[PDB]
RNA sequence: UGCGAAAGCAGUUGAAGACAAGUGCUUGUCGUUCGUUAUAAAUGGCCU
């Protein structure tokens, strides 16, 4: 519905992460989300047609 | 598995005088407007340029009609005596006109107030005034003085060249395309004279004999010229200087003639020729100048014209009558938020590796009778055959299909007098036609053999067989008679 | 046939005609896998 | 000068036995399901399902054993692989000849021909689940009678032995 | 190799030993429906003769259409003659002309002979 | 060819096949293909069999 | 710019080992270059890969063990942990791992039979035995501040001298453990240090279009070979008969008889790959044996393709044309142009 | 680095899916194109593309048979009464699922769908199933390969979303 | 069924056995045989 409306929630604490995403993180109108089966990659598509890729260093 | 075949409409063997692709094009000049002028409309001309308005000369005035509006938009009434031409130049900026007084006036097209140039060609009437197609600066004038002066717009005091040698009125002048030096004139002597402006001139290179007073001379192609005079029009070849074809299907003296090429019709080229008998007829030069269409008007036609090749809009056919009537026939030619959300529909996969198409083309919607046959509704398919406003040929197909499927008795079981009369009413009319006579016999034979008992007790059905008996007896007389004319015809051969 | 030969059909629907190293061991092994 | 030679093929072969229904089709689809083997009256054609083209044809005339055997007999079944033992097929004919042929390659001139011993029996059908083979045979009111044997290959004698189970 | 199957022509390639096409050349109840019970007594139009011009650009076909039984017009066969074309790249023949009752009514065409290359460039035929 | 769905007694159809269906069979570990035998009963002079292998997913001839 | 981080043909030039990244893990795979085997069996794709189970772990060096020399073909992989992995491609598993005591990454490796030499980021030499699987000796030579490259001079059947380069090139004697001769190398770090023949070895640096041919015995630059763009790979044929260098722009430059105005020589033949539609396909590696040249390019994303060409007959400027998918109408073998089924009969239409 | 940077899209990315084993990412949208990228994190080049004429993509997803690991397939769907399957380079093997076997009324679009694994306990065989959203509470379950209609599930009210959970029983 | 043209011209459609039903007798049948050229009817109609 709106821009930058993506949140990551830690389980089983159920606490929303604070450091990321930030005001400068480019997400746009998020319309697709995917996690890689392994490697901790996060793919986010938006209305602009741009798939942006992030890596979670923990995995 | 294969898609279901569409039911094929019945087509009987061809009859004489079928519609031709040339006729189907010319019938589209439908919308007819009759305008009445004060005197005979002598000449009609079309502007070579967009929007292709046409100018009609009648009495002492010249009027320019809008192509789209089909109404007068400009009027030139400055002429005191009769006016005898309104041709435009190739650029379309100027239109020249002649007068009975002999004065030739050149006006700015679409500015009747301004007169650019006025030339006193002669003391006698000037019937023809035509701009040279290749060269804009030179203007040709032919008068009853029997000399066709070649004027220049720049020098209006003396003619550039004075072509002579005609022993009678010269009322026709033509410029041969691709031959700017050549000029053709046709007099009532019956001779078409060719002159070369490059040479000294004033003496024709050669003359072509038409044997009747020439009413108009037109150059269809660079090497052919068509000249209409007397009761026929003949086409001459300049290279051979002999007539290739002659067509005299007209009754009165042909008066005007026009030629249009490379227009969107099936025919590449057309030749329209007024008759003075009320007829303007189309001939095709590609088929030995054979007639292909015609129109009939109230009175003699003095002038005809058709919109140029590059009309770029609705086409026009104009006919001019001596009664003062002008006949015109015309062939007419959300939010930004939502769009950004749904944005990919325009893309056609131009940058993609593989393009895959499986959409089946949309087939024409099937009619009710076809749906019933497909769904094996034999009785309902028969009912759809006899409905108000059903095409006669389309009614014949469903009857043939049911016969072909072998379902003729099956379609006739659950019926009484109330629902049998529609079939018998059509049979009463279908028996007359040769195409549907044989099919009517099969269906009427079954209904009699299947409803003999119902016939006796039902009065209304009975009259349907008395009158049907009357008609089949009438068809017998026609079929017997056709055999007799056949027999005598064999005797002649 | 429009060439010299003739074709004939038989009622069994038969149309006859009357007319005039270590690397090498590796290459095998890699293909198997 | 002139010579006569067969060129094209013939009708697809069928289990032309009235009683059997649902077993008329003798064609088999390979284990990998990449090609379909269809017996004809004069050959065996292997078609590639993906490309829809006849990759291989085994003509009985070309082979001497097949020419002697079929050129009247007809294939009663095709079984993928070889019973005796990756592109092998075992062909059972009505008389009882068992022929191990190979597709996807070049046909060998000496296949593993065998012969099941049948006493006035016409082989009708064969089938298997896991290494176990049964054969159905016809013996003679215009109605035929059927017998069901167990088929096994003994390596010592290299022969097919038949043991009665039902009738 | 062209086989005139009943109401249809099979185009069969004997070099590759595979069928290349199956085309319906006549009207009739061909694949509109599956005939059952009494409908199975119906006879579809039979392609009696099929020939090619020497050039090979034209196909000439002759067909007999049989009326259904138990009608007045149940003994008058219909004889149809058709001329088809196709480009070499294409695979389907296109009907270009149709003649209903050639030679008269109920009179068969017993022989068809396409014309030689000399006369009209093989664009003619004789029917007898 | 009629696929009777026995759970609801419904049926799916594949009509206008080239000939009457002598034989049907479901061929595959997951029923990927259907093998059919067609007869073409128009030709009374001979029995014209045609073997058809259909892709069950979209009922298109995989191999005729 | 290239998905293939590193690549290396085998000495015979029939199999290519390439390392690429799958998600965040590097995978090592071997592919066959030739279109078909000697037996005539068609060559097929090799799906098996060696995955590095750690995202941090990376391959810094790859070196083939000569196929003829050893019974099992092996590729020796240097890694950034500071240990060397011996990889048997057939078993698709790492048979043995040579570990140095330290944790510094390995910059280069080279092999002569059982001998195996490497250099760490600490500028420390090491010696290893493949047969014995032991660390024989390790030492540090003074004045070798950096070491990006290591090559062993082919003198007889034993190693007596080593070539090393960081930005300048140095020759070191193993027993003396000291420098012997120093060559003025490139400004940038040296990238290739192959030895063409005796007393002639070529040298090239990162982001440089020039190769220096140095004389080992004298120490003077015999020639400078120049490419049209920056050089990435180098392959030498025979004994200085021909040199092929893969430029950074995706072209291949061949130098014919570089060892015969004279100081600077330009490439004689240039080879390019362009698809039928018009896109240019870069070349990332090549191999040149006697008279045939093997070109490798990537289709799809990471799939290597190969082509064998006889460079002798090729004209000077030659572009290979390849059919790559572009606006392909998708034809199914079960349908005709209009999508109608092939089994279906054509209907009758007047 | 962005996945789409190499070959940008002409619409919104309606669906994303990572291949279960290979390092491939799949994209789809109303541009009617299926673009597959090789995600490495640094280059992310495009493996292949597939334009489906007149077939907007609302959801797409990889599928690999749980038994036969070699079988890889891509299912895509939109606001249409059919569905596409792409078996996994001269041409593409595309099948269209468009038949519901008497249940067309309950299903007027395939746009919301999901793929799962179903074990046939009476034979212990495993196969894929395609689940769809119906008109009024209906979920239509189809065989992934043959396309046959297997079973239907009905709830009261408007069906909004559904998901799938697996519960192991024994070995 | 034979011949012929399509029209038509000649000529056939028999016996035994077994079964069912009704009452040894009557009728109808035949995934039975020998010989001669030799009405139908289980509510049951074609995809996307």
Curated annotation (Swiss-Prot), chain A:
Location relative to the cell: Nucleus, Nucleolus
WD repeats: 25-58
Record's signal peptide: none
Family: Belongs to the WD repeat UTP18 family.
Function statement: Involved in nucleolar processing of pre-18S ribosomal RNA and ribosome assembly.
Additional record remark: Present with 9570 molecules/cell in log phase SD medium.
Subunit structure of this chain's protein: Interacts with snoRNA U3. Interacts with MPP10, UTP21 and UTP25. Component of the ribosomal small subunit (SSU) processome composed of at least 40 protein subunits and snoRNA U3.
Protein known as: U3 small nucleolar RNA-associated protein 18
Gene (name only): UTP18
Curated annotation (Swiss-Prot), chain B:
WD repeat ranges, renumbered to this chain: 36-77, 78-117, 123-161, 165-205, 209-246, 249-293
Major localization class: nucleus
Classification via InterPro entries: U3_snoRNA-assocProt_15_C, WD40/YVTN_repeat-like_dom_sf, WD40_repeat_CS, WD40_repeat_dom_sf, WD40_rpt
GO CC annotation: 90S preribosome; nucleolus; nucleoplasm; rDNA heterochromatin; small-subunit processome; t-UTP complex
Keywords: Nucleus, Repeat, Ribonucleoprotein, Ribosome biogenesis, rRNA processing, Transcription, WD repeat
Entry GO MF terms: U3 snoRNA binding
Protein's cellular compartments: Nucleus, Nucleolus
Gene3D superfamilies: YVTN repeat-like/Quinoprotein amine dehydrogenase
Subunit description: Interacts with snoRNA U3. Interacts with MPP10. Component of the ribosomal small subunit (SSU) processome composed of at least 40 protein subunits and snoRNA U3. In the absence of snoRNA3, forms a complex with other t-UTPs. This complex can associate with pre-18S ribosomal RNAs.
SUPFAM superfamilies: WD40 repeat-like
Protein name as it appears in the record: U3 small nucleolar RNA-associated protein 15
GO biological-process terms attached to the record: maturation of SSU-rRNA; maturation of SSU-rRNA from tricistronic rRNA transcript (SSU-rRNA, 5.8S rRNA, LSU-rRNA); positive regulation of transcription by RNA polymerase I; rRNA processing
Top-rank taxon, per record: Eukaryota
Function statement: Involved in nucleolar processing of pre-18S ribosomal RNA. Required for optimal pre-ribosomal RNA transcription by RNA polymerase I together with a subset of U3 proteins required for transcription (t-UTPs).
More info: Present with 358 molecules/cell in log phase SD medium.
UniProt gene name: UTP15
From Swiss-Prot, chain D:
Lineage: superkingdom: Eukaryota
Localisation: Nucleus, Nucleolus
Miscellaneous note of the record: Present with 6560 molecules/cell in log phase SD medium.
Function per UniProt: Involved in nucleolar processing of pre-18S ribosomal RNA. Required for optimal pre-ribosomal RNA transcription by RNA polymerase I together with a subset of U3 proteins required for transcription (t-UTPs).
SUBUNIT field: Interacts with snoRNA U3. Interacts with MPP10. Component of the ribosomal small subunit (SSU) processome composed of at least 40 protein subunits and snoRNA U3. In the absence of snoRNA3, forms a complex with other t-UTPs. This complex can associate with pre-18S ribosomal RNAs.
Name of the protein in its database record: NET1-associated nuclear protein 1
The organism of origin for this protein: Saccharomyces cerevisiae (strain ATCC 204508 / S288c)
Gene encoding the protein: NAN1
Swiss-Prot record, chain G:
Disulfide partners: none
GO CC terms of this entry: nucleolus; nucleoplasm; rDNA heterochromatin; small-subunit processome; t-UTP complex
Keyword Transmembrane: no
Keyword Nucleotide-binding among UniProt keywords: no
Regions crossing the membrane: none
Start-end of each WD repeat: 13-53, 54-97, 185-224, 226-260
Keyword annotations of the record: Nucleus, Repeat, Ribonucleoprotein, Ribosome biogenesis, rRNA processing, Transcription, WD repeat
Subcellular location: Nucleus, Nucleolus
GO biological process: maturation of SSU-rRNA; maturation of SSU-rRNA from tricistronic rRNA transcript (SSU-rRNA, 5.8S rRNA, LSU-rRNA); positive regulation of transcription by RNA polymerase I
Family: Belongs to the UTP5 family.
Task of the protein: Involved in nucleolar processing of pre-18S ribosomal RNA. Required for optimal pre-ribosomal RNA transcription by RNA polymerase I together with a subset of U3 proteins required for transcription (t-UTPs).
Subunit structure, interactors included: Interacts with snoRNA U3. Interacts with MPP10. Component of the ribosomal small subunit (SSU) processome composed of at least 40 protein subunits and snoRNA U3. In the absence of snoRNA3, forms a complex with other t-UTPs. This complex can associate with pre-18S ribosomal RNAs.
Additional comment: Present with 33100 molecules/cell in log phase SD medium.
Name the UniProt record assigns to this protein: U3 small nucleolar RNA-associated protein 5
